[PDB]
Amino acid sequence: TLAFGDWIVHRRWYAGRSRELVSAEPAVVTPLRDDLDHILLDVTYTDGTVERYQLVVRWADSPVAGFGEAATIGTALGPQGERIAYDALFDPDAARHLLRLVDASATVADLRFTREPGATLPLYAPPKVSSAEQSNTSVIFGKDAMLKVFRRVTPGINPDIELNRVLAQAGNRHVARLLGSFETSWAGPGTDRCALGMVTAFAANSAEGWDMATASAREMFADVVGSDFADESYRLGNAVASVHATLAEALGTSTEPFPVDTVLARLQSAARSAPELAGRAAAVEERYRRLDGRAITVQRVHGDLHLGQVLRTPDDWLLIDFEGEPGQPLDERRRPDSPLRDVAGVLRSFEYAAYQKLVELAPEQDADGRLADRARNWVDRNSAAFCAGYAAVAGDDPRRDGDVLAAYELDKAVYEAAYEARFRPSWLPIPMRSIDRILGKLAAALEHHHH
Numbered sequence: 358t359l360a361f362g363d364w365i366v367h368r369r370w371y372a373g374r375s376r377e378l379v380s381a382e383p384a385v386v387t388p389l390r391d392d393l394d395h396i397l398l399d400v401t402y403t404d405g406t407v408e409r410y411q412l413v414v415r416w417a418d419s420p421v422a423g424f425g426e427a428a429t430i431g432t433a434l435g436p437q438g439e440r441i442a443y444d445a446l447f448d449p450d451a452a453r454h455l456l457r458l459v460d461a462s463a464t465v466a467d468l469r470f471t472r473e474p475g476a477t478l479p480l481y482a483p484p485k486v487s488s489a490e491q492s493n494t495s496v497i498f499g500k501d502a503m504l505k506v507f508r509r510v511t512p513g514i515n516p517d518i519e520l521n522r523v524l525a526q527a528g529n530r531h532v533a534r535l536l537g538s539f540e541t542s543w544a545g546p547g548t549d550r551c552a553l554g555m556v557t558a559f560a561a562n563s564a565e566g567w568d569m570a571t572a573s574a575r576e577m578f579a580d581v582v583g584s585d586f587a588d589e590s591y592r593l594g595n596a597v598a599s600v601h602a603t604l605a606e607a608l609g610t611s612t613e614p615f616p617v618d619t620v621l622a623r624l625q626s627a628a629r630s631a632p633e634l635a636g637r638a639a640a641v642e643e644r645y646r647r648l649d650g651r652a653i654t655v656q657r658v659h660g661d662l663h664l665g666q667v668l669r670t671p672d673d674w675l676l677i678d679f680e681g682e683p684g685q686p687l688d689e690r691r692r693p694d695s696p697l698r699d700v701a702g703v704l705r706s707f708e709y710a711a712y713q714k715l716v717e718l719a720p721e722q723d724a725d726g727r728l729a730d731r732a733r734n735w736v737d738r739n740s741a742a743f744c745a746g747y748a749a750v751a752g753d754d755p756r757r758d759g760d761v762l763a764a765y766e767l768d769k770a771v772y773e774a775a776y777e778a779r780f781r782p783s784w785l786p787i788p789m790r791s792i793d794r795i796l797g798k799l800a801a802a803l804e805h806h807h808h
């Protein structure tokens with residue numbers, strides 16, 4: 358008996374939003390130790406919806422100073438007297454215990470832990486909770502591994518674990534390698550699987566693609582675009598194509614019609630958020646409908662790819678976070694899609710990395726548009742480098758099917774414009790400029806005028 362409800366509403370990973378909870382009760386309690394319980398917690402709302410959260414509880418007979426406020430769940434009477442319940446993920450000892458269960462591929466009641474074959478886990482390293490993790494909780498062990506424990510849990514195959522396992526077991530070097538994972542059932546033994554967490558190799562001394570890109574795009578008096586970041590963009594193209602190739606081989610390819618009705622529905626929705634889109638909607642729709650009946654090759658893909666999802670280690674680019682298109686239901690997130698849509702995601706990301714500078718300047722600071730010109734030249738150079746690097750591995754330039762590529766770029770820009778109109782009005786000119794540019798790029802490709 359803990360006041361779970363009173364505690365959970367204050368957590369940044371809690372997704373109850375503005376809603377009234379009816380109850381918050383443990384569906385399953387699994388003892389891991391005398392002073393350690395694993396809890397599946399069901400939160401029920403007034404509409405009858407239930408959301409399940411994973412909690413690990415460390416009990417103490419006396420307050421431990423090491424724990425903060427958000428780690429303090431509540432209190433309860435136990436068999437030896439009063440006890441305090443803490444969030445065990447903030448306990449180094451408890452986190453280590455979980456890692457040890459993974460290492461041993463332990464089974465505890467309906468909890469199944471598995472270590473990836475041949476993997477080594479850093480059981481000796483100091484565990485430190487990551488402040489960077491927002492929606493889940495990540496514990497970093499020294500510089501060797503990261504334990505990610507899912508907060509909200511849902512039934513079915515987890516694509517992040519799934520695709521990382523495929524890539525690691527195939528020996529693809531462009532991932533932060535999956536070392537282990539754990540899961541349980543949704544409604545007791547014999548029912549749907551429920552992913553609970555994952556352990557991955559930690560890429561020490563790494564840089565985020567977004568940070569490297571923006572640093573390059575901000576270099577002062579860089580009117581002649583540099584080859585050093587073009588070199589990196591090429592290598593990133595190599596990496597994305599290699600990941601796609603491994604996924605295609607393992608999980609197959611198929612053909613589908615280009616999804617005209619899906620992207621039209623997204624356009625219609627977007628135009629309601631951003632009135633500025635109405636003036637472009639007819640032209641966008643024209644381009645989409647020209648792809649009606651166009652067969653496209655699809656496969657398993659990353660699904661949410663941009664420069665924030667790639668890490669540069671001293672040796673390689675890695676892709677991380679394969680959970681899929683955010684806001685989409687699971688079955689949708691495991692659907693195959695065009696590799697060109699992933700490529701489009703990176704191209705959108707280059708555009709933002711370069712043009713973020715401009716929206717943050719006063720008009721007087723670029724009156725003649727020469728900084729805007731440089732941004733354009735920078736995006737062009739690094740986009741070309743990325744596609745060339747992709748091509749070197751894929752043996753097919755993603756620009757060859759230019760109409761399909763440009764359509765996916767357009768759909769992302771339309772979606773971006775609706776986001777900026779609502780949440781960041783001063784950023785809206787970035788996707789609006791892209792839309793006018795891409796409409797021409799797409800128009801040209803449809804006529805086979807692209808190189």
Ligand SMILES: [Mg+2]
Nearest residue numbers: 665666677678
């Ligand atoms: Mg991410």
